[model samples]
Target: LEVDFKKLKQIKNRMKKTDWLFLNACVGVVEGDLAAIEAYKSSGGDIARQLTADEVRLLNRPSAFDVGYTLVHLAIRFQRQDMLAILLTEVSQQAAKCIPAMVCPELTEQIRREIAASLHQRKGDFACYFLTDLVTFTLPADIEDLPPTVQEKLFDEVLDRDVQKELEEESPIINWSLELATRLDSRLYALWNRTAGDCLLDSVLQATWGIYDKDSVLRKALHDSLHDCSHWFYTRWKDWESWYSQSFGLHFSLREEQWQEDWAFILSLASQPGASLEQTHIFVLAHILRRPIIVYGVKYYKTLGYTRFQGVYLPLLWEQSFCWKSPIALGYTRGHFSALVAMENDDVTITFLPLVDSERKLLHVHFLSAQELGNEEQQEKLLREWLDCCVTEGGVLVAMQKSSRRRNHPLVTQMVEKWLDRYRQIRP
Candidate 1:
């Protein structure tokens, strides 16, 4: 439909203009003093210069491609069934959940961001760059302010055994995770040890709260806050819920008793343990720990993603300096969350914070948590600049065209064992 006659004429000229050298511009005397005849019709055409299950690079990855440009696309768009016939060598059977369409890429970007966080930061020039997320729990240098309440409750088992057993049996997924972590660095440990249950909720818990004896430790702290910090806790929750209500827009009328009971249920969960926690919970938890928390999550096949819980959560209402200036990281994958700690005494690996997404255009990067700051223009710049401090080469970040979780000199890691030594004494 879009064929330009001008291009077709040009193609016709080039078609006759075969290859090889003659006198001035080639061709003269192939049969001695004979003016050679030009090619008329070996082919009359527009040449096209250009994966769909064994076609899982959609799952694996490569150079950023703008989902719409390709030869196969041209076959359909240009209405060439002949080309479509040859090009459609492989059948695409909807790919069985490996990819959930457009929403897929962003979640991978989040987890990819964390994996880079694990790499820490750096200085280097390479053709392609990769980033990894970090994981580990930390004990504040001054816990005197927060209270030693969780310690008094005494539930010392840290690793979730059932999850540990689950991970032990995992051959395809996590097996490579541990292998990759160790191959990258012996100290590198994977906290993504559980899923298929409460990993998503609990993963965030391990980062700051430490998940020390799940119920008693977590509930005791929350119930304690619910009791002492009553005004702050209640108002913040209601304020957030009020703002969150706009998300539903009266959502076209749920029963008053239903929504109110939903509110009561939240209160009940706060005092209970082993419940599903969410992004909003981290919003409040950030204030309690006084640390901005970064979430990294993965996109899985059969299970749908927890699309909401990834991004940076700063302690919005608290005074900046009074709260901790540093941040904690949590990596969530396939509905599970795990503490991602950047083990130190490490290299500031080359930073891959892209200033552009795949179209090779400018990218704002920070999305969800910005309104809290009330200035996105400045915050976008602030987030980029802030990343430089955490890891960079000013150019390292500024000069990226965005990658699809590819690789390079790669990353390294360490353990919480060093930090855990201190916590264990105070914990039990």
Candidate 2:
């Protein structure tokens, strides 16, 4: 409407005396239209006064369905808090029958039923029939009366009954329990019977919960078996030899920027063959700076592919010899590895050895000479040089051996004990 100040003031004055008013002259200067006023009321508007009979009929231009949609949208927009409370307080009636199914099908059904019941319950005989044929199938045929709450409660009861029946017939308990039991049985059976042959199987299969449990048992058995077999035989059992050479690596997650430097540093350490003054210097700096470093090693196999791991690396020493009991932390990779005196000064390089193994046993442990690692026989002489050189400040010198067979090979047991005791006395 092309509202002028004078026309707008007239409409405002009328709105005060009527239940509703609307300005709808398009481009005209008319103050208000009766049809527009009826639309405003049907959309749930209310003024300060009630409508007279002529005022209602004069303004009742909207069909009942159009009024319901307008009322719903009015409630959604502007959030007409006052009008909304009044409209929502009245239960839905048959007049509201075609609300779309997608929005709330269940609520639509309930509305249908409640409206049907409300008409009959209120004794609106002719009005009740209009609700029935057009709305719900719920109203009793000889319907007389019902309370507002009863009509609403009956609709809720019907929905709950339908849903409960559907759930009972399709319960998921049986199928789920059967699958769980089958998995548990399979896992338990595997756990009870792990053996040495299992280790030769695939790595994934070897680490299975069942195999892991069995390996603990097999580990003790292998230890005893190695002791018994080495007593009367010159060569170590192949499985024991394999177990001896296995060591694990420690890993750290690194950012992309650090990857190149970290890899270079690790490979450089691995290439050294044995402990050296240069290697010790770098190792000390890394330790003091708290760099992410890993101690790891690999196993050599005569008949199988190599495997790598990370964690504590302990050798299966044959001598039941006693010495200083401080735990040792060692790091190695392939045939190269190092042991650091973690608790003491890093000035000394204790031992770095070239590890060799064959189908028979660990054939040699060679010490590093100058920049290169010595061979088996040369390592024997070099061990003395390493021992003498490292002995300052009562440091311990440790060396690996192919066999602790002699039970009394001085190099096999006593020399290692002296080095250990010397380290402990100084550190303690």
Candidate 3:
């Protein structure tokens, strides 16, 4: 739809500007803009003398492995070597106080274990299903009438549930523009997970949710609808055989009786609880919800022909205006999926930056170089210069390797730790 352009632009407009002073100075460092850097000292931006807890919260969010390095690290990592001196001189004056002798490789070891522990996982869940009094969404009495065996399976695998916190802790972030988040209360969506590679299920539920489906209410409703909805054992399979043979490079046929047997088998699969959801399931969900489902995931798989996921799952089954134009965002990582939601919980500005790209250059340099927005040409030219410091994939990999290879990064680890230590405590 021409309106794909419309939705994209609206999503961009929803991003409210960040007034946080910490980010202003960061623009100076990342962009090599003198005014933003100099303004950092004059303005109240020097509170941390570097990055803040929340700035690190988003920047160091642990999205990709070997990421989450600090400001100085980002400079060095992004090869913003020229900005390196300026950041030290103006923005990161506190980072200048680091006593290299006091910090040790041993310190990073403890942090290493936490990251390792997080990346690994175990499986467990406390079942959760909620129904609202409002007609907005509910667990209808119709669901309770299903057979007892049916109900048990639905609750066990099909319903939304929370597994162990550790498994969910590595929640793959799927962020939309911050503006979209402010309009909708972020809490209306809940993240879910179960077996390996279930972020697909987790994200779909999160994207579709206005409230909670708590029980298997929505799933059961859809499941029953598919069985009761019209279709053909012969006619549909007849359509399928032509497409199947043409694509598979073979001719095939099934007897009328055999087609019904195969059809009965699939209908039985639909009735069962906890089966892995296929793309057809998403199409079915979109039609029932009367909305579009847009998925965001790594492009490599699709390029390599590994999986067919991503893009709009438009409810084409319905006429225009029959389905709502409002769409939900789903993010996929490998086999897993994560719901994309707007996050505005903190005023801290953040983005996935400093990483190398296919060009083997600094990626998302625009965020880093936003200091001189009007000087668009200069920003591009300068962003390319930043890439000059680290030219090759080998060079960037070497940088990440050296920083995390049990060697304490002098500036980031020290200052961040001391400031955090100056405050209070918690334990598990």
Per-residue C-alpha lDDT of model 2 across residues 287-363, encoded as one tens digit per residue: 11112112223343223655332222122121112111112223332222232111111122122211222111222
lDDT agreement of model 2 with the native: 0.26
Best by lDDT: 3
The segments of candidate 2 whose C-alpha lies over 4 angstroms from its true place after superposition are 1-298, 301-371, 388-428
TM-score of each: 0.39, 0.15, 0.34
- The whole-model C-alpha lDDT of candidate 1 against the native structure comes to 0.37
Considering TM-score, where higher is better, how would the candidates rank from best to worst? 1, 3, 2
What are the per-residue Cα lDDT tens digits for candidate 3 across 1-428? 22355544555464333324445546555556656645544442333344544454333324311323344665565557776675666444333332111123234334333322322111223111111111111122333444666544433432333321211234322222222223322321223343333344445544433222223445554555446542522243345345435555886776778867766655664466665655545555555655555554443454566434544454544455454444455555555555543322222221121133223332221112123333534544543322222223234310110112123233334533442332212121
**Model 2, position 144: C-alpha lDDT score:** 17
Worst 10 residues of 2 by lDDT: 185-194
> Per-model C-alpha lDDT, please?
0.37, 0.26, 0.39
In candidate 2, residue 84 scores what lDDT?
48
User: By TM-score, is 2 or 3 better?
Assistant: 3
Better of 1 and 2 by TM-score: 1
Per-residue lDDT of 64 in model 2: 21
| Model 1, total clashes | 26
